[PDB]
Amino acid sequence: RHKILHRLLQE
Amino acid sequence: DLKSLAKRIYEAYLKNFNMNKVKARVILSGPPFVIHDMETLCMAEKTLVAKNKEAEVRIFHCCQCTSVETVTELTEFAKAIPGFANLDLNDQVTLLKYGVYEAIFAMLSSVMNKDGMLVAYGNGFITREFLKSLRKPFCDIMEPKFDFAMKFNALELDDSDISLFVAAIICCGDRPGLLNVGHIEKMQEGIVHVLRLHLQSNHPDDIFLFPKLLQKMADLRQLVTEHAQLVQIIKKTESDAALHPLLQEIYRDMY
Ligand SMILES: CC(C)(Sc1ccc(CCN(CCCCC2CCCCC2)C(=O)NC2CCCCC2)cc1)C(=O)O
């Protein structure tokens, strides 16, 4: 549901 | 290692934000291009922004791009806060979701004075009056932020204070929908503890500065609550004001 932010967090 | 939790957070602040208070005050003292009317806005768009609608819609799009970048810097800053990368990914997301704009409006104070705000990486300066001159609803976005900033800046914080304050904002244990509340509250407890000791040392002449700052965190929560209401209005009533995806994620279901 927060796709981009979840992406940012795992980098 | 309390003195090193502070230094770790400060270092992460200097590493991750392009703009900070010492840089802004150097520029705001002694030259940014002043944007104070329609003519100067157009000239500024020619020289500071690469790639046609109402002035207000172009300003809104530039602001969005900026917020997309600040949200990105704040995420990197958050990952460098001790303990944050250990939380549940859902709680990481929930903490940034509700935290970023509280952090953004705190840091916005650093580039604001009562006449205007420093923008575009230090290279422009938009007057408060010009922003008031815009048509509704866009003349309502920035003003409450200037009002907050004038009260905030009167506390005379520096970047070492602000970095801890922003860490404390992000590590808030009462956001809607946190799964592991106790783990977040324990993190926040340590950051706030370090903030209290740091203010006591860095500002030994303001004996109430710590509770003054706690109150500013509640003020920023109300400020973001109202801001999200103005954005929802904009998103219904303005055909040309769509949100960048990352910003839609952040605002969806916020308040
Ligand atoms: C976009 C919404 C929907 S409303 C909103 C939110 C935030 C802001 C402040 C954006 N801004 C002016 C960006 C000014 C750009 C300038 C305009 C004139 C022509 C040249 C370019 C700026 O300098 N922000 C700082 C960045 C450094 C760190 C602190 C914050 C304005 C509106 C959102 O809420 O995201």
PDB file of C-alpha atoms and ligand atoms in Angstrom:
ATOM      1  CA  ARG A   1       0.000   0.000   0.000  1.00  0.00           C
ATOM      2  CA  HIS A   2       3.058   2.302   0.364  1.00  0.00           C
ATOM      3  CA  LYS A   3       4.980   0.797  -2.513  1.00  0.00           C
ATOM      4  CA  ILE A   4       7.613   3.470  -3.148  1.00  0.00           C
ATOM      5  CA  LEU A   5       8.341   4.191   0.504  1.00  0.00           C
ATOM      6  CA  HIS A   6       8.664   0.472   1.181  1.00  0.00           C
ATOM      7  CA  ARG A   7      11.133   0.343  -1.695  1.00  0.00           C
ATOM      8  CA  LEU A   8      13.121   3.242  -0.277  1.00  0.00           C
ATOM      9  CA  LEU A   9      13.226   1.602   3.164  1.00  0.00           C
ATOM     10  CA  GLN A  10      14.658  -1.709   1.966  1.00  0.00           C
ATOM     11  CA  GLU A  11      17.547  -0.073   0.047  1.00  0.00           C
TER      12      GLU A  11
ATOM     13  CA  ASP B   1      26.844   6.409  24.822  1.00  0.00           C
ATOM     14  CA  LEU B   2      24.367   9.289  25.011  1.00  0.00           C
ATOM     15  CA  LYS B   3      26.863  11.842  23.696  1.00  0.00           C
ATOM     16  CA  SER B   4      27.407   9.531  20.696  1.00  0.00           C
ATOM     17  CA  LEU B   5      23.697   8.873  20.020  1.00  0.00           C
ATOM     18  CA  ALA B   6      23.422  12.640  19.662  1.00  0.00           C
ATOM     19  CA  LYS B   7      26.497  12.775  17.409  1.00  0.00           C
ATOM     20  CA  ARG B   8      25.318   9.871  15.293  1.00  0.00           C
ATOM     21  CA  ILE B   9      22.003  11.607  14.771  1.00  0.00           C
ATOM     22  CA  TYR B  10      23.650  14.955  14.010  1.00  0.00           C
ATOM     23  CA  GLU B  11      26.033  13.306  11.520  1.00  0.00           C
ATOM     24  CA  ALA B  12      23.144  11.600   9.808  1.00  0.00           C
ATOM     25  CA  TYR B  13      21.431  14.997   9.568  1.00  0.00           C
ATOM     26  CA  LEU B  14      24.462  16.693   7.979  1.00  0.00           C
ATOM     27  CA  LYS B  15      24.936  13.733   5.626  1.00  0.00           C
ATOM     28  CA  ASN B  16      21.374  13.521   4.388  1.00  0.00           C
ATOM     29  CA  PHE B  17      19.965  17.059   4.051  1.00  0.00           C
ATOM     30  CA  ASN B  18      21.171  19.378   1.312  1.00  0.00           C
ATOM     31  CA  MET B  19      19.855  22.450   3.149  1.00  0.00           C
ATOM     32  CA  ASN B  20      20.352  23.147   6.814  1.00  0.00           C
ATOM     33  CA  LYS B  21      20.285  26.077   9.198  1.00  0.00           C
ATOM     34  CA  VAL B  22      23.932  27.162   9.119  1.00  0.00           C
ATOM     35  CA  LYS B  23      23.880  27.180   5.301  1.00  0.00           C
ATOM     36  CA  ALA B  24      20.554  29.079   5.145  1.00  0.00           C
ATOM     37  CA  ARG B  25      21.574  31.767   7.633  1.00  0.00           C
ATOM     38  CA  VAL B  26      24.853  32.395   5.757  1.00  0.00           C
ATOM     39  CA  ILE B  27      22.850  33.078   2.572  1.00  0.00           C
ATOM     40  CA  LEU B  28      20.035  35.004   4.293  1.00  0.00           C
ATOM     41  CA  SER B  29      22.650  37.372   5.789  1.00  0.00           C
ATOM     42  CA  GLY B  30      25.032  38.287   2.916  1.00  0.00           C
ATOM     43  CA  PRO B  31      22.725  36.611  -3.691  1.00  0.00           C
ATOM     44  CA  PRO B  32      19.524  34.559  -4.141  1.00  0.00           C
ATOM     45  CA  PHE B  33      17.261  35.648  -6.978  1.00  0.00           C
ATOM     46  CA  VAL B  34      14.224  37.344  -5.400  1.00  0.00           C
ATOM     47  CA  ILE B  35      10.864  36.101  -6.625  1.00  0.00           C
ATOM     48  CA  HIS B  36       8.373  38.817  -5.626  1.00  0.00           C
ATOM     49  CA  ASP B  37       6.009  39.247  -8.581  1.00  0.00           C
ATOM     50  CA  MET B  38       4.861  37.424 -11.731  1.00  0.00           C
ATOM     51  CA  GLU B  39       7.745  38.769 -13.776  1.00  0.00           C
ATOM     52  CA  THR B  40      10.410  37.475 -11.405  1.00  0.00           C
ATOM     53  CA  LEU B  41       8.674  34.096 -11.067  1.00  0.00           C
ATOM     54  CA  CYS B  42       8.828  33.643 -14.839  1.00  0.00           C
ATOM     55  CA  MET B  43      12.502  34.674 -14.914  1.00  0.00           C
ATOM     56  CA  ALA B  44      13.247  32.275 -12.051  1.00  0.00           C
ATOM     57  CA  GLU B  45      11.539  29.414 -13.892  1.00  0.00           C
ATOM     58  CA  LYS B  46      13.722  30.228 -16.943  1.00  0.00           C
ATOM     59  CA  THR B  47      16.962  30.096 -14.978  1.00  0.00           C
ATOM     60  CA  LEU B  48      16.359  27.581 -12.103  1.00  0.00           C
ATOM     61  CA  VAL B  49      13.900  24.997 -13.459  1.00  0.00           C
ATOM     62  CA  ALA B  50      14.516  22.972 -16.637  1.00  0.00           C
ATOM     63  CA  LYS B  51      11.243  22.188 -18.501  1.00  0.00           C
ATOM     64  CA  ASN B  52       2.814  26.462 -19.279  1.00  0.00           C
ATOM     65  CA  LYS B  53      -0.288  26.601 -16.906  1.00  0.00           C
ATOM     66  CA  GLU B  54      -1.379  29.120 -14.271  1.00  0.00           C
ATOM     67  CA  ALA B  55       1.465  30.499 -12.159  1.00  0.00           C
ATOM     68  CA  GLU B  56      -0.069  28.800  -9.096  1.00  0.00           C
ATOM     69  CA  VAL B  57      -0.111  25.364 -10.744  1.00  0.00           C
ATOM     70  CA  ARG B  58       3.547  25.676 -11.823  1.00  0.00           C
ATOM     71  CA  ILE B  59       4.558  26.706  -8.295  1.00  0.00           C
ATOM     72  CA  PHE B  60       2.595  23.717  -6.924  1.00  0.00           C
ATOM     73  CA  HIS B  61       4.374  21.296  -9.252  1.00  0.00           C
ATOM     74  CA  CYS B  62       7.808  22.619  -8.312  1.00  0.00           C
ATOM     75  CA  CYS B  63       6.873  22.363  -4.626  1.00  0.00           C
ATOM     76  CA  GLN B  64       5.811  18.739  -5.106  1.00  0.00           C
ATOM     77  CA  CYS B  65       9.084  17.860  -6.744  1.00  0.00           C
ATOM     78  CA  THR B  66      10.849  19.421  -3.792  1.00  0.00           C
ATOM     79  CA  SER B  67       8.722  17.512  -1.265  1.00  0.00           C
ATOM     80  CA  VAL B  68       9.438  14.252  -3.133  1.00  0.00           C
ATOM     81  CA  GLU B  69      13.152  14.918  -2.599  1.00  0.00           C
ATOM     82  CA  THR B  70      12.737  15.909   1.057  1.00  0.00           C
ATOM     83  CA  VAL B  71      10.699  12.760   1.775  1.00  0.00           C
ATOM     84  CA  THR B  72      13.558  10.810   0.230  1.00  0.00           C
ATOM     85  CA  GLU B  73      16.204  12.530   2.346  1.00  0.00           C
ATOM     86  CA  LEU B  74      14.070  12.015   5.505  1.00  0.00           C
ATOM     87  CA  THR B  75      13.787   8.271   4.749  1.00  0.00           C
ATOM     88  CA  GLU B  76      17.582   8.036   4.542  1.00  0.00           C
ATOM     89  CA  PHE B  77      17.891  10.072   7.721  1.00  0.00           C
ATOM     90  CA  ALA B  78      15.376   7.777   9.439  1.00  0.00           C
ATOM     91  CA  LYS B  79      17.337   4.664   8.473  1.00  0.00           C
ATOM     92  CA  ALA B  80      20.361   6.158  10.194  1.00  0.00           C
ATOM     93  CA  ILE B  81      18.537   6.646  13.524  1.00  0.00           C
ATOM     94  CA  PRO B  82      19.687   3.917  15.954  1.00  0.00           C
ATOM     95  CA  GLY B  83      17.018   1.228  16.176  1.00  0.00           C
ATOM     96  CA  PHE B  84      14.840   2.422  13.311  1.00  0.00           C
ATOM     97  CA  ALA B  85      16.071  -0.132  10.758  1.00  0.00           C
ATOM     98  CA  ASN B  86      15.309  -2.809  13.380  1.00  0.00           C
ATOM     99  CA  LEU B  87      11.613  -2.046  13.522  1.00  0.00           C
ATOM    100  CA  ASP B  88       8.990  -3.838  11.495  1.00  0.00           C
ATOM    101  CA  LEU B  89       8.895  -2.592   7.908  1.00  0.00           C
ATOM    102  CA  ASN B  90       5.201  -1.691   8.364  1.00  0.00           C
ATOM    103  CA  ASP B  91       6.060   0.429  11.400  1.00  0.00           C
ATOM    104  CA  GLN B  92       8.947   2.049   9.514  1.00  0.00           C
ATOM    105  CA  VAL B  93       6.460   3.015   6.829  1.00  0.00           C
ATOM    106  CA  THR B  94       3.855   4.188   9.361  1.00  0.00           C
ATOM    107  CA  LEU B  95       6.398   6.328  11.218  1.00  0.00           C
ATOM    108  CA  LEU B  96       7.564   8.086   8.015  1.00  0.00           C
ATOM    109  CA  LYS B  97       4.024   8.443   6.682  1.00  0.00           C
ATOM    110  CA  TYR B  98       2.900  10.513   9.640  1.00  0.00           C
ATOM    111  CA  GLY B  99       6.302  11.959  10.484  1.00  0.00           C
ATOM    112  CA  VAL B 100       7.716  13.417   7.257  1.00  0.00           C
ATOM    113  CA  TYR B 101       5.618  16.561   7.039  1.00  0.00           C
ATOM    114  CA  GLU B 102       6.068  17.368  10.712  1.00  0.00           C
ATOM    115  CA  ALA B 103       9.795  17.135   9.967  1.00  0.00           C
ATOM    116  CA  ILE B 104       9.468  19.049   6.703  1.00  0.00           C
ATOM    117  CA  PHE B 105       7.704  22.013   8.321  1.00  0.00           C
ATOM    118  CA  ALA B 106      10.220  22.081  11.202  1.00  0.00           C
ATOM    119  CA  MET B 107      13.139  22.194   8.767  1.00  0.00           C
ATOM    120  CA  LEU B 108      11.292  24.705   6.497  1.00  0.00           C
ATOM    121  CA  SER B 109      11.589  27.156   9.397  1.00  0.00           C
ATOM    122  CA  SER B 110      15.340  27.147   8.924  1.00  0.00           C
ATOM    123  CA  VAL B 111      15.017  28.756   5.472  1.00  0.00           C
ATOM    124  CA  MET B 112      12.245  31.181   6.441  1.00  0.00           C
ATOM    125  CA  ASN B 113      12.376  34.723   7.796  1.00  0.00           C
ATOM    126  CA  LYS B 114       9.396  37.056   8.192  1.00  0.00           C
ATOM    127  CA  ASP B 115       9.838  38.351   4.603  1.00  0.00           C
ATOM    128  CA  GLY B 116      10.172  35.165   2.578  1.00  0.00           C
ATOM    129  CA  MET B 117      11.742  31.742   2.161  1.00  0.00           C
ATOM    130  CA  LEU B 118      14.996  30.592   0.608  1.00  0.00           C
ATOM    131  CA  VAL B 119      14.220  28.058  -2.144  1.00  0.00           C
ATOM    132  CA  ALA B 120      15.893  25.990  -4.883  1.00  0.00           C
ATOM    133  CA  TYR B 121      19.032  24.895  -3.053  1.00  0.00           C
ATOM    134  CA  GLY B 122      19.789  28.417  -1.816  1.00  0.00           C
ATOM    135  CA  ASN B 123      19.482  30.110  -5.225  1.00  0.00           C
ATOM    136  CA  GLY B 124      16.064  31.820  -4.931  1.00  0.00           C
ATOM    137  CA  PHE B 125      14.102  33.708  -2.333  1.00  0.00           C
ATOM    138  CA  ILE B 126      10.311  33.848  -2.549  1.00  0.00           C
ATOM    139  CA  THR B 127       8.641  36.661  -0.665  1.00  0.00           C
ATOM    140  CA  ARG B 128       5.924  35.859   1.806  1.00  0.00           C
ATOM    141  CA  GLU B 129       3.739  38.574   0.183  1.00  0.00           C
ATOM    142  CA  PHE B 130       4.054  37.066  -3.279  1.00  0.00           C
ATOM    143  CA  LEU B 131       2.728  33.763  -1.938  1.00  0.00           C
ATOM    144  CA  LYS B 132      -0.140  35.582  -0.240  1.00  0.00           C
ATOM    145  CA  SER B 133      -0.803  37.303  -3.611  1.00  0.00           C
ATOM    146  CA  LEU B 134      -1.601  33.968  -5.293  1.00  0.00           C
ATOM    147  CA  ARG B 135      -5.159  32.923  -5.853  1.00  0.00           C
ATOM    148  CA  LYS B 136      -7.061  30.646  -3.476  1.00  0.00           C
ATOM    149  CA  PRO B 137      -6.403  27.838  -2.489  1.00  0.00           C
ATOM    150  CA  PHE B 138      -2.676  28.236  -3.170  1.00  0.00           C
ATOM    151  CA  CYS B 139      -2.196  31.444  -1.127  1.00  0.00           C
ATOM    152  CA  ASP B 140      -3.268  29.356   1.943  1.00  0.00           C
ATOM    153  CA  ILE B 141      -0.562  26.664   1.738  1.00  0.00           C
ATOM    154  CA  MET B 142       2.504  28.564   2.920  1.00  0.00           C
ATOM    155  CA  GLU B 143       1.222  31.239   5.318  1.00  0.00           C
ATOM    156  CA  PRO B 144       0.480  28.986   8.309  1.00  0.00           C
ATOM    157  CA  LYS B 145       3.982  27.571   7.786  1.00  0.00           C
ATOM    158  CA  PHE B 146       5.526  31.075   8.039  1.00  0.00           C
ATOM    159  CA  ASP B 147       3.524  31.690  11.209  1.00  0.00           C
ATOM    160  CA  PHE B 148       4.779  28.449  12.777  1.00  0.00           C
ATOM    161  CA  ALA B 149       8.366  29.203  11.641  1.00  0.00           C
ATOM    162  CA  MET B 150       8.447  32.651  13.190  1.00  0.00           C
ATOM    163  CA  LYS B 151       7.531  31.126  16.575  1.00  0.00           C
ATOM    164  CA  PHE B 152       9.945  28.190  16.057  1.00  0.00           C
ATOM    165  CA  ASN B 153      12.882  30.372  14.992  1.00  0.00           C
ATOM    166  CA  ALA B 154      12.494  32.517  18.099  1.00  0.00           C
ATOM    167  CA  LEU B 155      13.794  29.502  20.047  1.00  0.00           C
ATOM    168  CA  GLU B 156      17.133  29.988  18.280  1.00  0.00           C
ATOM    169  CA  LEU B 157      17.855  26.298  17.729  1.00  0.00           C
ATOM    170  CA  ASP B 158      20.891  25.189  15.746  1.00  0.00           C
ATOM    171  CA  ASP B 159      21.330  22.156  13.542  1.00  0.00           C
ATOM    172  CA  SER B 160      22.563  19.959  16.418  1.00  0.00           C
ATOM    173  CA  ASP B 161      19.217  20.665  18.227  1.00  0.00           C
ATOM    174  CA  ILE B 162      17.137  20.317  15.056  1.00  0.00           C
ATOM    175  CA  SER B 163      18.624  16.945  14.128  1.00  0.00           C
ATOM    176  CA  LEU B 164      17.551  15.487  17.476  1.00  0.00           C
ATOM    177  CA  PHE B 165      14.171  17.211  17.301  1.00  0.00           C
ATOM    178  CA  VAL B 166      13.525  15.678  13.874  1.00  0.00           C
ATOM    179  CA  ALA B 167      14.627  12.263  15.130  1.00  0.00           C
ATOM    180  CA  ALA B 168      12.164  12.624  18.037  1.00  0.00           C
ATOM    181  CA  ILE B 169       9.355  13.624  15.606  1.00  0.00           C
ATOM    182  CA  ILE B 170       9.920  10.557  13.450  1.00  0.00           C
ATOM    183  CA  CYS B 171      10.196   8.131  16.414  1.00  0.00           C
ATOM    184  CA  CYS B 172       6.658   8.813  17.679  1.00  0.00           C
ATOM    185  CA  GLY B 173       5.011   5.931  19.513  1.00  0.00           C
ATOM    186  CA  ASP B 174       1.363   7.020  19.099  1.00  0.00           C
ATOM    187  CA  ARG B 175       0.941   7.056  15.316  1.00  0.00           C
ATOM    188  CA  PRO B 176      -2.189   5.316  13.966  1.00  0.00           C
ATOM    189  CA  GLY B 177      -1.664   1.671  13.271  1.00  0.00           C
ATOM    190  CA  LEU B 178       1.734   0.921  14.771  1.00  0.00           C
ATOM    191  CA  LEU B 179       2.162  -2.794  15.402  1.00  0.00           C
ATOM    192  CA  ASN B 180       5.005  -2.828  17.967  1.00  0.00           C
ATOM    193  CA  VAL B 181       4.223   0.271  20.046  1.00  0.00           C
ATOM    194  CA  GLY B 182       6.531  -0.599  22.941  1.00  0.00           C
ATOM    195  CA  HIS B 183       9.580  -0.938  20.689  1.00  0.00           C
ATOM    196  CA  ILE B 184       8.957   2.515  19.232  1.00  0.00           C
ATOM    197  CA  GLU B 185       8.306   4.113  22.639  1.00  0.00           C
ATOM    198  CA  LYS B 186      11.569   2.776  23.978  1.00  0.00           C
ATOM    199  CA  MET B 187      13.464   4.283  20.985  1.00  0.00           C
ATOM    200  CA  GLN B 188      11.728   7.614  21.404  1.00  0.00           C
ATOM    201  CA  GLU B 189      12.439   7.602  25.134  1.00  0.00           C
ATOM    202  CA  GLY B 190      16.166   7.448  24.456  1.00  0.00           C
ATOM    203  CA  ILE B 191      16.095  10.144  21.742  1.00  0.00           C
ATOM    204  CA  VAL B 192      14.063  12.488  23.911  1.00  0.00           C
ATOM    205  CA  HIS B 193      16.383  11.778  26.850  1.00  0.00           C
ATOM    206  CA  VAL B 194      19.391  12.737  24.724  1.00  0.00           C
ATOM    207  CA  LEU B 195      17.500  15.817  23.433  1.00  0.00           C
ATOM    208  CA  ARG B 196      16.789  17.043  26.976  1.00  0.00           C
ATOM    209  CA  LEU B 197      20.439  16.664  28.002  1.00  0.00           C
ATOM    210  CA  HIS B 198      21.629  18.238  24.751  1.00  0.00           C
ATOM    211  CA  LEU B 199      19.392  21.312  25.163  1.00  0.00           C
ATOM    212  CA  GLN B 200      20.432  21.692  28.788  1.00  0.00           C
ATOM    213  CA  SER B 201      24.063  21.868  27.669  1.00  0.00           C
ATOM    214  CA  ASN B 202      23.672  23.759  24.365  1.00  0.00           C
ATOM    215  CA  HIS B 203      21.185  26.372  25.671  1.00  0.00           C
ATOM    216  CA  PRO B 204      21.920  26.753  29.407  1.00  0.00           C
ATOM    217  CA  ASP B 205      20.068  30.072  29.556  1.00  0.00           C
ATOM    218  CA  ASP B 206      16.559  28.852  28.486  1.00  0.00           C
ATOM    219  CA  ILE B 207      15.410  26.695  31.395  1.00  0.00           C
ATOM    220  CA  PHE B 208      12.121  25.771  29.686  1.00  0.00           C
ATOM    221  CA  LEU B 209      13.475  25.018  26.220  1.00  0.00           C
ATOM    222  CA  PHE B 210      12.781  21.269  26.442  1.00  0.00           C
ATOM    223  CA  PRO B 211       9.036  21.546  27.270  1.00  0.00           C
ATOM    224  CA  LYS B 212       8.813  24.453  24.732  1.00  0.00           C
ATOM    225  CA  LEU B 213      10.009  21.975  22.114  1.00  0.00           C
ATOM    226  CA  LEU B 214       7.655  19.203  23.168  1.00  0.00           C
ATOM    227  CA  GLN B 215       4.862  21.680  22.733  1.00  0.00           C
ATOM    228  CA  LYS B 216       6.178  22.536  19.236  1.00  0.00           C
ATOM    229  CA  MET B 217       5.859  18.853  18.309  1.00  0.00           C
ATOM    230  CA  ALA B 218       2.151  18.930  19.152  1.00  0.00           C
ATOM    231  CA  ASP B 219       1.826  22.248  17.242  1.00  0.00           C
ATOM    232  CA  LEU B 220       3.422  20.590  14.192  1.00  0.00           C
ATOM    233  CA  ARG B 221       0.973  17.673  14.468  1.00  0.00           C
ATOM    234  CA  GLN B 222      -1.961  20.096  14.320  1.00  0.00           C
ATOM    235  CA  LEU B 223      -0.189  21.993  11.503  1.00  0.00           C
ATOM    236  CA  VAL B 224       0.139  18.823   9.406  1.00  0.00           C
ATOM    237  CA  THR B 225      -3.485  17.831  10.215  1.00  0.00           C
ATOM    238  CA  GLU B 226      -4.714  21.136   8.764  1.00  0.00           C
ATOM    239  CA  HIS B 227      -2.197  20.947   5.901  1.00  0.00           C
ATOM    240  CA  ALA B 228      -3.514  17.537   4.863  1.00  0.00           C
ATOM    241  CA  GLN B 229      -7.041  19.030   4.805  1.00  0.00           C
ATOM    242  CA  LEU B 230      -5.966  21.823   2.448  1.00  0.00           C
ATOM    243  CA  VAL B 231      -4.268  19.239   0.218  1.00  0.00           C
ATOM    244  CA  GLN B 232      -7.426  17.082   0.083  1.00  0.00           C
ATOM    245  CA  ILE B 233      -9.414  20.154  -0.971  1.00  0.00           C
ATOM    246  CA  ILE B 234      -6.803  20.909  -3.662  1.00  0.00           C
ATOM    247  CA  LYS B 235      -6.917  17.304  -4.915  1.00  0.00           C
ATOM    248  CA  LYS B 236     -10.714  17.452  -5.444  1.00  0.00           C
ATOM    249  CA  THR B 237     -11.175  20.988  -6.754  1.00  0.00           C
ATOM    250  CA  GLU B 238      -8.110  21.521  -8.985  1.00  0.00           C
ATOM    251  CA  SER B 239      -7.907  19.662 -12.289  1.00  0.00           C
ATOM    252  CA  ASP B 240      -4.215  20.340 -12.839  1.00  0.00           C
ATOM    253  CA  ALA B 241      -2.839  19.586  -9.387  1.00  0.00           C
ATOM    254  CA  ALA B 242      -2.297  15.831  -9.302  1.00  0.00           C
ATOM    255  CA  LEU B 243       0.091  14.487  -6.621  1.00  0.00           C
ATOM    256  CA  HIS B 244       3.364  12.771  -7.453  1.00  0.00           C
ATOM    257  CA  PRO B 245       2.995   9.055  -6.622  1.00  0.00           C
ATOM    258  CA  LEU B 246       5.190   9.048  -3.533  1.00  0.00           C
ATOM    259  CA  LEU B 247       3.206  12.003  -2.160  1.00  0.00           C
ATOM    260  CA  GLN B 248      -0.100  10.270  -2.894  1.00  0.00           C
ATOM    261  CA  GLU B 249       1.079   7.256  -0.898  1.00  0.00           C
ATOM    262  CA  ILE B 250       1.931   9.541   1.986  1.00  0.00           C
ATOM    263  CA  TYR B 251      -1.321  11.539   2.004  1.00  0.00           C
ATOM    264  CA  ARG B 252      -3.706   8.634   1.294  1.00  0.00           C
ATOM    265  CA  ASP B 253      -5.715   7.980   4.472  1.00  0.00           C
ATOM    266  CA  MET B 254      -3.573  10.361   6.491  1.00  0.00           C
ATOM    267  CA  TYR B 255      -5.957  12.474   8.513  1.00  0.00           C
TER     268      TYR B 255
HETATM  269  C1  LIG C   1       3.524  20.080  -2.534  1.00  0.00           C
HETATM  270  C2  LIG C   1       2.523  19.885  -1.389  1.00  0.00           C
HETATM  271  C3  LIG C   1       1.232  19.178  -1.828  1.00  0.00           C
HETATM  272  S1  LIG C   1       2.162  21.434  -0.500  1.00  0.00           S
HETATM  273  C4  LIG C   1       3.813  22.118  -0.118  1.00  0.00           C
HETATM  274  C5  LIG C   1       4.724  21.433   0.692  1.00  0.00           C
HETATM  275  C6  LIG C   1       5.979  21.992   0.919  1.00  0.00           C
HETATM  276  C7  LIG C   1       6.300  23.229   0.344  1.00  0.00           C
HETATM  277  C8  LIG C   1       7.676  23.891   0.501  1.00  0.00           C
HETATM  278  C9  LIG C   1       8.496  23.356  -0.716  1.00  0.00           C
HETATM  279  N1  LIG C   1       9.626  24.222  -0.938  1.00  0.00           N
HETATM  280  C10 LIG C   1       9.519  25.288  -1.938  1.00  0.00           C
HETATM  281  C11 LIG C   1       9.910  24.919  -3.369  1.00  0.00           C
HETATM  282  C12 LIG C   1       9.983  26.221  -4.197  1.00  0.00           C
HETATM  283  C13 LIG C   1      10.371  25.934  -5.637  1.00  0.00           C
HETATM  284  C14 LIG C   1      10.550  27.238  -6.421  1.00  0.00           C
HETATM  285  C15 LIG C   1       9.202  27.820  -6.794  1.00  0.00           C
HETATM  286  C16 LIG C   1       9.351  29.048  -7.698  1.00  0.00           C
HETATM  287  C17 LIG C   1      10.179  28.810  -8.946  1.00  0.00           C
HETATM  288  C18 LIG C   1      11.516  28.151  -8.562  1.00  0.00           C
HETATM  289  C19 LIG C   1      11.336  26.927  -7.682  1.00  0.00           C
HETATM  290  C20 LIG C   1      10.812  24.106  -0.126  1.00  0.00           C
HETATM  291  O1  LIG C   1      11.737  24.845  -0.280  1.00  0.00           O
HETATM  292  N2  LIG C   1      10.843  23.024   0.862  1.00  0.00           N
HETATM  293  C21 LIG C   1      11.982  22.875   1.723  1.00  0.00           C
HETATM  294  C22 LIG C   1      13.130  22.178   1.006  1.00  0.00           C
HETATM  295  C23 LIG C   1      14.262  21.950   2.013  1.00  0.00           C
HETATM  296  C24 LIG C   1      13.841  21.199   3.281  1.00  0.00           C
HETATM  297  C25 LIG C   1      12.618  21.843   3.955  1.00  0.00           C
HETATM  298  C26 LIG C   1      11.484  22.105   2.971  1.00  0.00           C
HETATM  299  C27 LIG C   1       5.382  23.887  -0.439  1.00  0.00           C
HETATM  300  C28 LIG C   1       4.151  23.321  -0.667  1.00  0.00           C
HETATM  301  C29 LIG C   1       3.134  19.052  -0.289  1.00  0.00           C
HETATM  302  O2  LIG C   1       2.623  19.305   0.847  1.00  0.00           O
HETATM  303  O3  LIG C   1       4.072  18.204  -0.484  1.00  0.00           O
END
